[PDB]
Structure formats: structure tokens, C-alpha cells
Design a protein around this ligand. Sequence first.
Ligand SMILES: */C1=C/C(=O)OC/C=C/CCO[C@@H](c2ccccc2)[C@H](NC(=O)[C@@H](NC(=O)c2cc(C)on2)C(C)C)C(=O)N[C@H]1C[C@@H]1CCNC1=O
Length: 181
Amino acid sequence: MGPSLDFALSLLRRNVRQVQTDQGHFTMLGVRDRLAVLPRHSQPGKTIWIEHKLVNILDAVELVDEQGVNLELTLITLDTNEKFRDITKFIPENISTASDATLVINTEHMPSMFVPVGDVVQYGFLNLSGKPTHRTMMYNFPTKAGQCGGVVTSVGKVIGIHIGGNGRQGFCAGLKRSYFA
Ligand SMILES: */C1=C/C(=O)OC/C=C/CCO[C@@H](c2ccccc2)[C@H](NC(=O)[C@@H](NC(=O)c2cc(C)on2)C(C)C)C(=O)N[C@H]1C[C@@H]1CCNC1=O
């Protein structure tokens, strides 16, 4: 097997989880230790269903920028035995565009799903259902509901978490390594 498929299948295997909150199904990315990230609008409660079992959330941190604008990412710390494979090395130090990126979705309804989004490019401000959002990026692919939390990647580098769309374009919250320090 080639390398870009291996990396994506490895992600699926040890870092990308099927989850359910009171808001529906999402893809969850485990980053390291007991630390994971979800789209802010998944609104994780005191517990979250992960794959096959209810897992308690010890702490949740919705990220905003330095003038307090939404970044659309929640950092959750899980009460689990498992430590995630530390993938913080694959996350750039600053938000990074990409070409020929792939969106990795993993949900009960959309399991192990690989979506050839295009090049990924910058955006900044997004109006997502009345929530103004910064540090977002864009890909000209018609993503759809149920794909939030999906992992944007290209060439072994984890760069965004899918958060929204419009039927012709998809938008992710950019990832940077300092979020997970
Ligand atoms: C991802 C998750 C999903 O389907 O779930 C259920 C959705 C619940 C409602 C909340 O999710 C919306 C949201 C995101 C961030 C902050 C607040 C709310 C989100 N909203 C949208 O994507 C909407 N689009 C826009 O507002 C918009 C602005 C610009 C510019 O372009 N689009 C909505 C589609 C009108 C949401 O539903 N995200 C959802 C994935 C998208 C559904 C449609 N295509 C997607 O990629």
C-alpha cells in the first residue's frame, strides 16, 4: 500500500472516532493523551458516546481568538484508560493551506469515509448560522450535514476540522499545534 492511504487509514485506526452528542453524529479527533477536539457546535455535555461506550468528559474548552471571537473548536479531556497516539507533530505550527486535500469522516452513519475535497485555502471570517468565526479555511467541494468534525489532511499533515458548508463549498476550522500544547 502507498503512503497517503496508509497515513489516512492509520488516522482512522487510532485517532479518528465515531461520536454522538445531543446534537447528532460527529467525527472526533484524538490528538494526544486524553485530549480530543470537536466542533464547538457539537455541544458535548458531561458525557459523550464514543464508538461503543459512554465516556465522561472531565473538561471542555471552547477556543476563541485574542479578541474573543469564536474559533469553533472545543478541546475535551476524557476520562479514559486510553492515551491517544500523539499526532501533534503532524499539526502545523500555524494554520496552513494545502492542495489535493482529503477529508476523513468517521461516524456511525458515515464510517471510514474518504472525501476528495480540493485544494484548501484561507478565509478568516465565516458567518456560520449567526456565529461569526475566525481562522477558517475553504475547499470548493459540496460537503453536507453529518460531516462535521471530519479531519482535513494532505501529505501526512493534519490541518483542519470540518465545521460548515453551503451546498457548494465547505469550511474547516484551521488547526495549529499550540492549541494542543
Ligand atoms: C455540520 C454538522 C452537522 O450537520 O450537525 C448538525 C448541525 C447542527 C447545527 C449547527 O451547525 C452549524 C454551525 C456551525 C458553526 C457555528 C454555528 C452553527 C453549521 N452551519 C452551517 O454550515 C450553515 N452554513 C452557513 O452558515 C454558511 C455561511 C457561509 C458563508 O457558508 N455557509 C448551514 C448549512 C446553513 C452546520 O450545519 N454544519 C454542518 C455541516 C454543513 C451542513 C451543510 N454543509 C455542511 O458542510
